[PDB]
Design a protein around this ligand. Structure first.
Ligand SMILES: [Ca+2]
Length: 95
């Protein structure tokens, strides 16, 4: 199960390749930044969305984690919906 996965994960999996400027399966807010700055969300929210997707809690956005953040930001670009407060069991990745 996962809040994001279909087209969304694809629309992102393709961006993570352009987001993870270090191609290390982990893009940092510093790279996805512009990508997040192109979204149109307020800094705080974008930083709040980074922790809402950075389930890795390591300081970077893994490959599938950066796809969970757009699941929120994207909702504000075409669905105008706030972010799901904090992390949820449907957001947290499988381990
Ligand atoms: Ca990176």
């Amino acid at each position: 199960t996962w809040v994001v996965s279909p087209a969304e994960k694809a629309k992102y999996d393709e961006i993570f390749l352009k987001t993870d400027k270090d191609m290390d399966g982990f893009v940092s807010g510093l790279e996805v930044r512009e990508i997040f700055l192109k979204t149109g969300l307020p800094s705080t929210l974008l930083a709040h969305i980074w922790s809402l997707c950075d389930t890795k809690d390591c300081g970077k956005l893994s490959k599938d984690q950066f796809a969970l953040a757009f699941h929120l930001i994207s909702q504000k670009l075409i669905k105008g919906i706030d972010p799901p407060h904090v992390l949820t069991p449907e957001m947290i990745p499988p381990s």
